[PDB]
Amino acid sequence: AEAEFNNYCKIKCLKGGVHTACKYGSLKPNCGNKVVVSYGLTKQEKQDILKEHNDFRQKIARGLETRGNPGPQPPAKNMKNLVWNDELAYVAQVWANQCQYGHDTCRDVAKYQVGQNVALTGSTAAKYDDPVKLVKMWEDEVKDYNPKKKFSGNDFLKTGHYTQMVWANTKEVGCGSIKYIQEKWHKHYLVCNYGPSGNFKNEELYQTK
Ligand code: NA
């Protein structure tokens, strides 16, 4: 939470926009009339999310992901595990606390531009998916990823989450979470910020082996 003391109002994102942590200088949920059940991630949840990201990156890197359009995904020569980043997690959490599904306009930090994956599920029952389950939703996009084509040649709407997960240049991840009730839908919102950002148009996901 130490990051809350950084002045994000001085951060400038490539496409402009007021930084999320400048817009909201509070770490307290700000969800209109929605009923916030809980917010944040436990030490174990953060570790589980990190492990899932890394187990996935390694699966891909070792040439073990058979899914694709067509599969399999090629092995990687430069795939390193991600490490959890508290600042990314903080900014992700501030965004999550707005309960506004989608991407926030400016989330970059002092060190680099930042990418982001969001996940949301709603149920009529008072139950909330495990964070890892939401992460796997992003992974499954790999079924629609065609490695015979470069990154820009693929369908971003269908694979944009997958590509950010396996972006070789991305080295850090930090996520935020919140469970709320909106018009009787029990929703779990997961926001994960990545540093440095991935999904750059003229680049490849990772160096193939
Ligand atoms: Na296939």
Curated annotation (Swiss-Prot):
It comes from the Eukaryota. It is found in: Secreted. InterPro entries: Allrgn_V5/Tpx1_CS, CAP_dom, CAP_sf, CRISP-related, V5_allergen-like. Its main location: secreted. It holds the Pfam family CAP. The keyword Nucleus does not apply. The keyword Signal applies. This is Venom allergen 5. It comes from Vespula vulgaris. The lineage of its organism: Eukaryota, Metazoa, Ecdysozoa, Arthropoda, Hexapoda.
